[PDB]
Amino acid sequence: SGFRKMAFPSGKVEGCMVQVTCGTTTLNGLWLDDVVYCPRHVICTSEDMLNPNYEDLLIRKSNHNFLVQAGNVQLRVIGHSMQNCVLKLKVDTANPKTPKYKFVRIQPGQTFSVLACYNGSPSGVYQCAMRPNFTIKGSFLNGSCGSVGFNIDYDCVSFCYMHHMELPTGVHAGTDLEGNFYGPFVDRQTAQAAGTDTTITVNVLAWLYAAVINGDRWFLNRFTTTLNDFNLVAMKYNYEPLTQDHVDILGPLSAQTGIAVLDMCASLKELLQNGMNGRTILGSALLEDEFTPFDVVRQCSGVTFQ
Amino acid sequence: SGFRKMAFPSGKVEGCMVQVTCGTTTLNGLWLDDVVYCPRHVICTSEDMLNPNYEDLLIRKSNHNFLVQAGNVQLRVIGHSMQNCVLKLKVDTANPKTPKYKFVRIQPGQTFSVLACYNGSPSGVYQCAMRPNFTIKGSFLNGSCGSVGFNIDYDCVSFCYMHHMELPTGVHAGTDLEGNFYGPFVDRQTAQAAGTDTTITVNVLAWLYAAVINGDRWFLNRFTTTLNDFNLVAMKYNYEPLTQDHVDILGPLSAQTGIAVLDMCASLKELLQNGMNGRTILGSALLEDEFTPFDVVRQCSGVTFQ
Numbered sequence: 001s002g003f004r005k006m007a008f009p010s011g012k013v014e015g016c017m018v019q020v021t022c023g024t025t026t027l028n029g030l031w032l033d034d035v036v037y038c039p040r041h042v043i044c045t046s047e048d049m050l051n052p053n054y055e056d057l058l059i060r061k062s063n064h065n066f067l068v069q070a071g072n073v074q075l076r077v078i079g080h081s082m083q084n085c086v087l088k089l090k091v092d093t094a095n096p097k098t099p100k101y102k103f104v105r106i107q108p109g110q111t112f113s114v115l116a117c118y119n120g121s122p123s124g125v126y127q128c129a130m131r132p133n134f135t136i137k138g139s140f141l142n143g144s145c146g147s148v149g150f151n152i153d154y155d156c157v158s159f160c161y162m163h164h165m166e167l168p169t170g171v172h173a174g175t176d177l178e179g180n181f182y183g184p185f186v187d188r189q190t191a192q193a194a195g196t197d198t199t200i201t202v203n204v205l206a207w208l209y210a211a212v213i214n215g216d217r218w219f220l221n222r223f224t225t226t227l228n229d230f231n232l233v234a235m236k237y238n239y240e241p242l243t244q245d246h247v248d249i250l251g252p253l254s255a256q257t258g259i260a261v262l263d264m265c266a267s268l269k270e271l272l273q274n275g276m277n278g279r280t281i282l283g284s285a286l287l288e289d290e291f292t293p294f295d296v297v298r299q300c301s302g303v304t305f306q
Numbered sequence: 307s308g309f310r311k312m313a314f315p316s317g318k319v320e321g322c323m324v325q326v327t328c329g330t331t332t333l334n335g336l337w338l339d340d341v342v343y344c345p346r347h348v349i350c351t352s353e354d355m356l357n358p359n360y361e362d363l364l365i366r367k368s369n370h371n372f373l374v375q376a377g378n379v380q381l382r383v384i385g386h387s388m389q390n391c392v393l394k395l396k397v398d399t400a401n402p403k404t405p406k407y408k409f410v411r412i413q414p415g416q417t418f419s420v421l422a423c424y425n426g427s428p429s430g431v432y433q434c435a436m437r438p439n440f441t442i443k444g445s446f447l448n449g450s451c452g453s454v455g456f457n458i459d460y461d462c463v464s465f466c467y468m469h470h471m472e473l474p475t476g477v478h479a480g481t482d483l484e485g486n487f488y489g490p491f492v493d494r495q496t497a498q499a500a501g502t503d504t505t506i507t508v509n510v511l512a513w514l515y516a517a518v519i520n521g522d523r524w525f526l527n528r529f530t531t532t533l534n535d536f537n538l539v540a541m542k543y544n545y546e547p548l549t550q551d552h553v554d555i556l557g558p559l560s561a562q563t564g565i566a567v568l569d570m571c572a573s574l575k576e577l578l579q580n581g582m583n584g585r586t587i588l589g590s591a592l593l594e595d596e597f598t599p600f601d602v603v604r605q606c607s608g609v610t611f612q
């Protein structure tokens with residue numbers, strides 16, 4: 001038993017990480033089949049960042065201005081193109097370690113694993129969620145750009161995030177693997193509003209179920225509530241409105257613990273109106289919202305991969 | 307910027323994980339060179355668990371009663387021996403994916419990465435610490451036994467933990483890779499006292515430095531204290547006594563942030579005497595003690611591996 005915030009094993013992704021250099025800028029790229037993916041702002045100088053014309057900037061570059069290094073090995077670039085905010089470098093060598101992969105665009109509230117990378121070498125791995133305002137709260141230093149987020153379905157790697165830039169909040173923004181930003185962000189060094197972040201109500205309920213499943217049950221009360229009543233408390237409190245779909249996705253945890261979702265909503269309501277009283281749930285003094293219901297199900301089912 | 311609880315990339319360890327079966331018991335093993343390591347209690351039936359004579363039980367077994375499966379592939383066992391509480395299965399095939407590795411026995415307060423495994427296939431990865439009472443608070447279901455903890459030094463894998471059993475606390479116990487338990491635990495299904503757990507004072511201070519480095523500085527005060535004065539507050543509060551060595555290891559974070567360790571101790575003291583007032587530090591409403599000072603240094607330095 002026990003419950004930890006847990007990332008997918010990153011082996012399948014480590015084999016895809018390469019170093020990409022263009023001029024005096026180095027960052028990470030994703031090497032799959034015979035294509036290298038990376039943020040297009042690798043083509044920018046530190047002055048270009050304030051207002052780049054990427055088309056014009058890309059025109060001044062040729063294949064040989066792009067150094068791709070996979071470990072020690074130099075790949076030869078033979079085609080380059082710009083898809084949205086990513087740059088796709090065609091190389092002469094397919095990656096012998098290409099996993100079975102997909103590119104997905106995830107939804108706010110879903111979770112994924114980040115492998116943070118510098119100079120093409122993996123640094124660490126951690127788990128997180130696409131916030132409702134389409135930011136992620138991660139850990140990214142200079143040179144982490146091009147690090148990717150992913151989920152694993154048995155053998156198949158679903159890539160969903162590529163890191164591009166930190167906002168003035170210490171929150172991070174980026175794109176899917178077709179180069180479209182999550183959220184309204186553009187890749188330019190100009191002030192940008194992240195927007196009001198809300199809490200992922202369904203994820204919090206799934207966590208409370210993970211708590212019950214792991215012995216923590218003090219928050220459990222004699223009350224119930226209605227979907228509309230609870231939603232009315234959800235909104236004084238920043239919470240995502242709870243829908244019937246949310247209720248259904250919480251259904252399996254419902255039946256395992258024998259606790260109705262709306263009874264659980266009542267306990268959450270009391271927590272939101274009465275706080276923690278200096279107590280903890282699964283060793284946190286806060287309400288945690290970065291476990292999807294599926295993260296909960298599989299953590300106490302033992303789903304494996306590879 | 308930002309600060310997450312971050313695990314080493316597990317690729318080097320995924321390639322070492324195999325399935326070990328003996329009778330009607332299956333668990334994970336660590337395959338390195340031509341040896342497979344696993345908990346010796348794989349040789350036990352569900353009745354044996356209450357009071358096993360491991361010597362006598364091991365005598366009834368022969369090499370062919372041990373099925374080792376590396377992915378799909380059956381290894382042939384040709385020698386078996388018992389070292390403390392681990393069992394070492396000599397196989398006819400060296401693991402072509404053996405990393406450069408070491409076996410270390412870590413100290414209370416140090417951190418490591420766990421790759422949780424079922425039937426020899428990795429499930430997830432998370433970070434944690436050997437508690438002062440020599441327990442770890444992880445996430446382990448039935449069949450997770452044989453999962454290992456590790457740190458990575460550039461290319462070299464330092465194995466330090468092998469999971470054996472959960473206590474009645476939802477805390478976990480296990481051995482180094484020579485088979486000696488951390489703590490006073492034995493591998494038997496008998497009630498065992500974990501013992502009073504204390505907080506890793508030096509780790510908490512290192513975190514407060516990580517906080518300052520990442521913008522969170524409200525806890526910072528106009529006071530200072532003495533090593534003995536603070537230690538006197540450390541003990542009403544469960545904290546490990548702070549030593550001069552602790553002070554020195556915190557020295558580099560000292561100089562980066564320009565804040566004396568004993569000034570930081572005063573802020574921690576006020577936190578311990580006055581609580582959080584419903585506020586947060588790096589997004590936690592609790593004082594976090596599972597980052598060593600070295601975890602902090604490298605997270606905001608960007609150390610890579612492979």
Ligand SMILES: *[C@H](O)[C@H](C[C@@H]1CCNC1=O)NC(=O)[C@H](CC1CCCCC1)NC(=O)[C@@H](NC(=O)OCc1ccccc1)[C@@H](C)OC(C)(C)C
Pocket residue numbers: 027041044048049052140141142143144145146164165166167168172186187188189190191192307
């Ligand atoms: C790639 O390695 C990095 C990763 C950053 C660096 C440290 N932490 C990270 O997450 N990405 C960058 O450095 C990019 C580079 C430019 C981005 C697109 C345009 C051309 C290249 N920039 C940022 O990450 C900046 N974000 C940013 O400026 O956003 C808009 C803005 C501007 C001014 C005030 C507020 C907001 C970073 C460097 O800016 C901060 C200084 C605010 C972090």
Ligand SMILES: *[C@H](O)[C@H](C[C@@H]1CCNC1=O)NC(=O)[C@H](CC1CCCCC1)NC(=O)[C@@H](NC(=O)OCc1ccccc1)[C@@H](C)OC(C)(C)C
Pocket residue numbers: 001333347350354355358446447448449450451452470471472473474478492493494495496497498
């Ligand atoms: C190996 O896959 C598992 C991993 C466990 C299972 C679920 N979570 C885990 O961490 N390990 C075990 O199942 C071992 C098996 C025996 C251990 C040594 C003797 C022979 C094999 N046992 C345990 O993990 C038990 N721990 C335990 O009993 O500790 C002493 C004790 C006894 C009675 C009351 C309190 C404490 C588990 C199964 O016991 C609990 C039911 C308390 C979890």
